[PDB]
Amino acid sequence: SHMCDAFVGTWKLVSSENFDDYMKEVGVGFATRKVAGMAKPNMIISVNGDVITIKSESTFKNTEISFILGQEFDEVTADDRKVKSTITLDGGVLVHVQKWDGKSTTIKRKREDDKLVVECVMKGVTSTRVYERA
Numbered sequence: 001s002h003m004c005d006a007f008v009g010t011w012k013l014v015s016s017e018n019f020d021d022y023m024k025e026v027g028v029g030f031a032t033r034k035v036a037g038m039a040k041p042n043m044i045i046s047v048n049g050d051v052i053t054i055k056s057e058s059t060f061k062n063t064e065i066s067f068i069l070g071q072e073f074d075e076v077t078a079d080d081r082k083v084k085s086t087i088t089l090d091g092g093v094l095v096h097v098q099k100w101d102g103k104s105t106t107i108k109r110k111r112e113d114d115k116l117v118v119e120c121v122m123k124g125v126t127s128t129r130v131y132e133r134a
């Protein structure tokens with residue numbers, strides 16, 4: 001048993017707050033915001049050795065990242081940003097930092113009760129997305 005055991009599984013989006021405003025702050029254009037905001041993604045987390053895989057499957061866009069904690073990787077986000085990402089575990093929270101064009105956003109993922117809570121921060125704007133087991 002290891003580092004991310006309580007994250008592993010298939011999760012379904014059950015609530016969202018402020019996501020449109022977060023996407024605006026990131027620089028996502030109107031049409032992409034509208035379609036991405038409608039999505040109800042399933043997020044699938046798995047671990048094999050030191051490699052963590054996070055897949056996001058939705059009607060908008062299927063994405064997949066695999067990574068080792070602390071080790072930078074290149075990521076193409078669902079809104080088509082080309083970013084440099086680093087994911088670490090900080091006090092039991094997965095902290096995912098994306099850097100591009102001189103900008104930075106942080107996505108935190110944590111277990112709280114039977115939920116997986118995702119907090120997306122770009123400058124002063126936070127969006128909270130709550131997932132439950134599928």
Ligand SMILES: O=c1cc(CNc2ccc(Cl)cc2)[nH]c2nc(-c3ccccc3)nn12
Nearest residue numbers: 011036043054078079107116118120129131
């Ligand atoms: O709902 C979101 C939103 C973001 C923020 N990235 C993002 C940026 C641009 C767009 Cl257009 C869409 C998404 N990251 C994120 N990770 C997970 C998640 C949930 C459960 C298990 C594993 C991962 N959900 N979630």
